[PDB]
Structures are given as C-alpha cells and as structure tokens.
Design a protein around this ligand. Structure first.
Ligand SMILES: *[C@@H]1O[C@H](CO)[C@@H](O[C@@H]2O[C@H](CO)[C@@H](O)[C@H](O)[C@H]2NC(C)=O)[C@H](O)[C@H]1NC(C)=O
Ligand SMILES: *[C@@H]1O[C@H](CO)[C@@H](O)[C@H](O)[C@H]1NC(C)=O
Ligand SMILES: *[C@@H]1O[C@H](CO)[C@@H](O)[C@H](O)[C@H]1NC(C)=O
Ligand SMILES: *[C@@H]1O[C@H](CO)[C@@H](O)[C@H](O)[C@H]1NC(C)=O
Ligand SMILES: *[C@@H]1O[C@H](CO)[C@@H](O)[C@H](O)[C@H]1NC(C)=O
Ligand SMILES: *[C@@H]1O[C@H](CO)[C@@H](O)[C@H](O)[C@H]1NC(C)=O
Lengths: 243, 191, 250, 49
C-alpha cells in the first residue's frame, strides 16, 4: 500500500521495531510502498449447544466483513451467522469488546446490559428502613486439594531399558528434581486439607434430641443410618461430581 | 500491533462499562451508604450516613453535625488535591504501567527470538529450505523448531506466573471493593 | 441455647434481640425453606460444582496429554523404544533414543511446571477456605461480602471431593418504607441525638428506630443524649422529649 | 508443519494455557467491578449537605 514515510535517497527498504520489514522503495520509481501482512486470525465458534440446537455462528477474530447468513462487524472481529439486535440482554456467550450472544430460534449478538436501571430517591430528609426481613442461605464452593499424582521420571522416559537409562543418567539430576517437586506437591495437598479442616483439636458431637427451637438441621448433620455418615447435601455433592 | 501469529483479544468489559459500574457503585455509596451491598438500596441523607461512619470509629455522631461545614471543606480540599497529587508525583501509576511494560516487553522479546539461528545456518527457515536439500534441511529445521518452541514455552510459563500474580492483586482488589467501598472496615490500614 | 445464640448473632449485626424472639417461628420457617431449596439449587443448576470439576478435569487432561506424548516420534524412526533397541545397532540406537529422551523429559518438565503453578493456585484457594472457616463458621465476620452477600449470621461447612462447600446464613433487609427524618431533635434549646438508630416521622409524630429494622419507639431521655444547642446542628425538627420521671412524680 | 506434527500436543497446551489466562482476565474484571445487581444512578441535584 502507499506510504508517507520519506525514505532517504540511499536506503531501499525499511524496518520496524523488533526487526521486521515495514516498507520498501520501488526500484523502478521513487515510490515507497508499505508492506502489511494480509489479514489473518484464529476462528471462533459460537454454539448454544448440541443439547439445545445444532445452530452455529462463526467469528473471524481480526478481519473485516469483506473476506469469506447475517454478517455483523464488531470490535472483536467479523461475526457471520448471528443477527445483531439493538436491545441489550444479560451476557450469555462471551464474544469480546462488549458483545455477548440464543433467542427466537436464532443466534443473536448484542451489547451487554450491566443490570437494571434504578435511581435512588435521595433527599436530605428521607430515610428508607426495612419493615421486614429475609434470611437467605448461599452456597460457596472452594477447592482445597487436588489428586496427588506422581510420575516416575526414569521409567516413564526410559521404559525398562538399560540402554536408555545410561543416557538418562548422562542427563544428570532431572529425574530427581521432578520426583522432588511432585513429592512436595503431594505433601502440600495434605497440608492444605489439614489447614482447611483440622481446626478443632477435639471432636464435638450433636445431642440425640433435635430440640433447636424450630430450626431443622437434619439436612446438614450426619445421618448415622448411612454407611458413610454423610449429610444429604454432602451426598448430593458426592453424587453430583463425576470422574 | 500485529506480527506473525500474535493476536490480542479485546476485553469483554470495555472501559465504558467499567466506568458505568464504578458510577453505579459511587451512586450507591453516596445515596445509600453500605446498605446496597447487603440488600436493597435504602435512602439515607449523606450527613446521617457520615454520622454513622463516625459512630463506627468511636467518635460520637454529634461531632459531625457541629462540624459539618469544616468536614465538608476538608473533604472537598482533599478530593481536589488528589488530582494534583497523582498528576504531579511521577511513578504514582507505576503499578499499572509496569504490567503493560512487562507484557509488551515479553511480546517484543518473543518476536526477537525469531531472528536467531539457534545454531543452524540462517534464522530464516525458507533460506535453509532453499539452500539445503530436504534430507539435510531436516536437521536445521529441527533446530529452528526446537529453539522457537522452547522460547514460546518460556514465554507461556512467565505469562502463567504473571497471571497468577495479577490474579492475586485482582482478588485483593475485589476484597477491598467489598470491604472498603461497599461497607466500612475496622481493619487497620487495610482501607 | 441455640435461639439465644442466633439472638446474639442478630445483636452483632445491629438488630436488637427482640426481633428474633417475637419472630422466631417465621425465622425458623425461612431458614428451613432456604436449606430445603439448597438441595434443588445444587442438584438442578449445572456448573454449580464447576469450580471443583475444573481442577480434576485439568489434572486428568494433563495426565492424558503426558501419556499421549509417549506416542510421539520426536524425530525418531519409531515411538516404541523397544523396537529401536531390538532392531538397530547400539551405535545408532543411541542417537535414536536421544531424540526420545529429550522429548519425553521436555514433556515431563512441562507437566511438572503446570502442576507447580496449579498447586500454587490450590494453595491460595485452600488458604482462603481456611480463613473463611476461621472467620465465618468458627466466629462471626463483620466484613461484608466475605461470608456471602448480606449481613452475616453464620456458616456451615460441608465436605466435597477435593473441596469445601459453605452454607452461609445471612440477614437481608426485605420490604421497606419511606420515612421523613432529621439528624436531631430540638427541645427547649437542647439538641437531642439518638444513642442507636435514627429519628423517623410519618408526618405527625417523631420516633426512634434501629436502622436495620423498623421498630418505632417513643423519644425519651434514656435513648437520646444531649450535646450543644439547636443553632449549631443543620436541619433540626421541633418535637418534645418525654422523661419517665414526669409521670412518676405527678 | 508436517514436521511439527511429530512433537505431539505442545501446540495445543500453549494455546489452552493462553486461553485460560485470557478468560481469567475477564473473570478478574468481573469479580472486581460487577458487584452490583443494579446500575444505580445519582440524582441530578448535588445537594449532599
Ligand atoms: C415478612 O416476610 C415473610 C416472608 O418473606 C412473611 O412470612 C410468610 O412467608 C411465606 C413464605 O415464606 C409467605 O407465603 C407468606 O405470605 C408470608 N406471610 C404470612 C402471613 O404467612 C411475613 O408475613 C412478613 N411479615 C410482614 C409483617 O410482612
Ligand atoms: C416515598 O418513597 C419515594 C420512592 O419510594 C420517595 O421518592 C419519597 O421521597 C418517599 N417519601 C415521601 C414523603 O414521598
Ligand atoms: C435540604 O436542606 C435545605 C436546608 O437544610 C432545604 O432548604 C432543602 O429543601 C433540603 N432539600 C430538600 C430536597 O428538601
Ligand atoms: C426436618 O427436615 C427433614 C428433611 O427430610 C424432615 O424429614 C423432618 O420431618 C423435618 N423435621 C424434623 C423435626 O426433623
Ligand atoms: C423550634 O423551637 C425553637 C425554640 O425552642 C424556635 O426558636 C424555633 O423557631 C422552632 N422552629 C424550628 C427550629 O423550626
Ligand atoms: C403515624 O404515626 C402515628 C403515631 O403512632 C399513628 O397514630 C398514625 O396512625 C400514623 N400514620 C399516619 C399519621 O398516617
């Protein structure tokens, strides 16, 4: 493409920061042409899911809408297959640069809404005060440990063969740093579980009569009639995560 | 910027939406104090809110009402001075500039590695392909693949560590967002 | 006694005890129904356990790719080293092995580094879980949004494979009202301020109430205190303050 | 590229780690800023005492 960089009479081609060709001076004239790599980029697929529908939209992350049925250009790239609708909704499938994306039996793209608009009736003589009250219970899930894996460096790399074992022994201590690191991680997982759970030096036990003033804790207290004395909720957690 | 194979994806929340979120949090703090964090936005006059905030630090609320004008003037003077403070003392934004500098330097030093032969005959794979026969170009291209892949691996590893550090800072930022803006903290020098 | 425990937990968040005891039955019904709803929430909303599934999936995938890196030539004439040792002369088997030692040790290095970083992430998440265990179930936290959204009352810990699940029981203001207010009461020249709570009016009468629950009380000398005079406080209304001593002497 | 195919799955490990970072950055921004269920708006009159 044309350029506005005035090359000096003695240079033929120009370079940009970090050693790349930026422009070159046409040998047969005095023109100076900039060289830009032609548009390319990764391709992203927007899918609601085969469980719901096999409809798909495809986004080209860094090209215009001139390079190969609605076609909409966004700051994230050129998205084909999704119709852009003016009204905002809660963000569902992330696209990028403020647009998210299924409704009305087609894939739609829109500017995300940040929440309902709610102005506060501020005044210097008016206070709102609650006249009733709701107790809510929320669930917060946190990882504490992960599977204590261990890989035998020498037998993994050099399966039961002395000939390769000699070369691996010529590679020094690598097969000892890896075992040491994995052992450290294995012990640190037990330390994590201990610090998360082992916070009471003695094991307390619930009374046999659940006369808690109308509160019912049967859903979180252990059930002795089960082979593993876990609560119903803990049962749901152990039956809900699959390997 | 755009080189060979390197892309930057845009953030999902544009600066306009981040500004709109901080405007929402400021309107909440101003018109309803800390109650918009716990539940619904409850209207409170700003002096009564600041009287609550004085009550929470062991200074009786009347101290606000008798000194309301002095408090307003000192708060306005400090808020006005913050602009000159951060705009006149260099390095004040170093914690944000350093992240950008490290990312740009990592990308530039990832690109610069492409112009290194890595022990072969020429850092351009097309030149070794055009000057050596395939049965012999194979080894030099193996060199230019192993070295470049090791460079990409080092870059990705350092990006994983830096992402962990920035995630720690983001978690502390969310903790401050909740425990300093959305409420009032009794934790000393935390806010 | 547990109802007194919950009454003190209400006191700790600025709601006087009498809110609980008069409404204990309703509080029990709401707590029980919320706990009942937790089952449906966990069992019906997918991705609810995503934070726990992601780590096991990442480790399974890292092991799967680590093993699949054994099925890779890395420039060798074959993937199975037994075939090179059984088919090639040692003078060349050495060179053919080297190009599998290098690639399998590099795969092992990649796996180990990713495991160190993910272990650091799990270390931080475990430390956060320990801090929440100390400050949400073992005690009561005044730091907002640390033990869930709302005013924290208590938390209940539950085990999970490779994780912990907290049931946070929190107090949320519900139906609300719009009342006129004033920062002080002017009475015969003295300025009255509330000890706890604020002054509210519905137009005609002034009362004192705790800020986190509407409970109107008559303005008296035992819930207000005097400081200064009426000409210093900006925005005062005029009402009368009743001293229980007057009806006792009259 | 056909020669690269002989190094296994390094070129998808790198492009899954970078995507993990990419999504983690949006998670960071959402977790820090998107703590309001509603977008509140200040009144037009700035008579804040
Ligand atoms: C305060 O709120 C609670 C619930 O929000 C009311 O208690 C009852 O709760 C159930 C559901 O939990 C509803 O079906 C009823 O409509 C509620 N009322 C009654 C009379 O049962 C409680 O009544 C509310 N209190 C006030 C004073 O409004
Ligand atoms: C009543 O409530 C509305 C909005 O809920 C508020 O604007 C108003 O100031 C309140 N008070 C009166 C006296 O209307
Ligand atoms: C705010 O206070 C001033 C004087 O204290 C009063 O004139 C004004 O009306 C008040 N604001 C409103 C909305 O009533
Ligand atoms: C408590 O909840 C459980 C849930 O299964 C229910 O079966 C039981 O009847 C409830 N009441 C008591 C007193 O346990
Ligand atoms: C309230 O009463 C005082 C005298 O006790 C009087 O001077 C004032 O004008 C009254 N009205 C007000 C403060 O609005
Ligand atoms: C306002 O409060 C007074 C005092 O309890 C009460 O008598 C009246 O019914 C309430 N409502 C009004 C005035 O609308």
């Amino acid at each position: 493409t044309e350029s506005n960089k005035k090359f000096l009479p003695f240079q033929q081609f120009g370079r940009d920061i970090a050693d790349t060709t930026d422009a070159v001076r046409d040998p047969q004239t005095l023109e100076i042409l900039d060289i830009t790599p032609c548009s390319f980029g990764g391709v992203s697929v927007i899918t609601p899911g085969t469980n719901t529908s096999n409809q798909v939209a495809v986004l080209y992350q860094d090209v215009n809408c001139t390079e190969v049925s609605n076609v909409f250009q966004t700051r994230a790239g050129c998205l084909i297959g999704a119709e852009h609708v003016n009204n905002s909704y809660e963000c569902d499938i992330p696209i990028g640069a403020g647009i998210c994306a299924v409704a009305s039996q087609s894939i739609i793209a829109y500017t995300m809404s940040l929440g309902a608009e709610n102005s506060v009736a501020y005044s210097n003589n008016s206070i709102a005060i609650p006249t009733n009250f709701t107790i809510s219970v929320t669930t917060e899930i946190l990882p504490v440990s992960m599977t204590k894996t261990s890989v035998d460096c020498t037998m993994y790399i050099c399966g039961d063969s002395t000939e390769c074992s000699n070369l691996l022994l010529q590679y020094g201590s690598f097969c000892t740093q890896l075992n040491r690191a994995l052992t450290g991680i294995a012990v640190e997982q037990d330390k994590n579980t201990q610090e998360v759970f082992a916070q009471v030096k003695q094991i307390y036990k619930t009374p046999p009569i659940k006369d808690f003033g109308g509160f019912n804790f049967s859903q979180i207290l252990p059930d002795p009639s089960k082979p593993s004395k876990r609560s119903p909720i803990e049962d749901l957690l152990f039956n809900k995560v699959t390997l | 910027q755009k080189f060979n194979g390197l892309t930057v994806l845009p953030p999902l929340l544009t600066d306009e939406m981040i500004a709109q979120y901080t405007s929402a949090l400021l309107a909440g703090t101003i018109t309803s104090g800390w109650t918009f964090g716990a539940g619904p936005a409850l209207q409170i006059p700003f002096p009564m809110q600041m009287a609550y905030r004085f009550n929470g630090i062991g200074v009786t609320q009347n101290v606000l009402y008798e000194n309301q004008k002095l408090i307003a003037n000192q708060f306005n003077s400090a808020i006005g001075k913050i602009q000159d403070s951060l705009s006149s003392t260099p390095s004040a934004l170093g914690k944000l500039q350093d992240v950008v500098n490290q990312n740009a330097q990592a990308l530039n030093t990832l690109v610069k590695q492409l112009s290194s032969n890595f022990g072969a005959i020429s850092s351009v794979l097309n030149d070794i392909l055009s000057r050596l026969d395939p049965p012999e170009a194979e080894v030099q291209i193996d060199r230019l693949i192993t070295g470049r892949l090791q460079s990409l691996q080092t870059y990705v590893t350092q990006q994983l560590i830096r992402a962990a550090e920035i995630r720690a800072s983001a978690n502390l930022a969310a903790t401050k967002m909740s425990e300093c803006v959305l409420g009032q903290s009794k934790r000393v020098d935390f806010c | 006694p547990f109802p007194m425990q919950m009454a003190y937990r209400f006191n700790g968040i600025g709601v006087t005890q009498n809110v609980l005891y008069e409404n204990q039955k309703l509080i029990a019904n709401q707590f029980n129904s919320a706990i009942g709803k937790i089952q449906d929430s966990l069992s019906s909303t997918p991705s609810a356990l995503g934070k726990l599934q992601d780590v096991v999936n990442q480790n399974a995938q890292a092991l799967n790719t680590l093993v699949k890196q054994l099925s890779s030539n890395f420039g060798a004439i074959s993937s199975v080293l037994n075939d090179i040792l059984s088919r090639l002369d040692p003078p060349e088997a050495e060179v053919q092995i080297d190009r599998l030692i290098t690639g399998r040790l590099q795969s092992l290095q990649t796996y180990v580094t990713q495991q160190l970083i993910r272990a650091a992430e799990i270390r931080a998440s475990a430390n956060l879980a320990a801090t929440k265990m100390s400050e949400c179930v073992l005690g009561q936290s005044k730091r907002v949004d640390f033990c869930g959204k709302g005013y924290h009352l208590m938390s209940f810990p539950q085990s999970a494979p490779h994780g912990v699940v907290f049931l946070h029981v929190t107090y949320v203001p519900a139906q609300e009202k719009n009342f006129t207010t004033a920062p002080a009461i002017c009475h015969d020249g003295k300025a009255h301020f509330p000890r706890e709570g604020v002054f509210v009016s519905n137009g005609t009468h002034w009362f004192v109430t705790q800020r986190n629950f509407y409970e109107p009380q008559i303005i008296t000398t035992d819930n207000t205190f005097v400081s200064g005079n009426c000409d210093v406080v900006i925005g005062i209304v005029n009402n009368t303050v009743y001293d229980p001593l007057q009806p006792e002497l009259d």
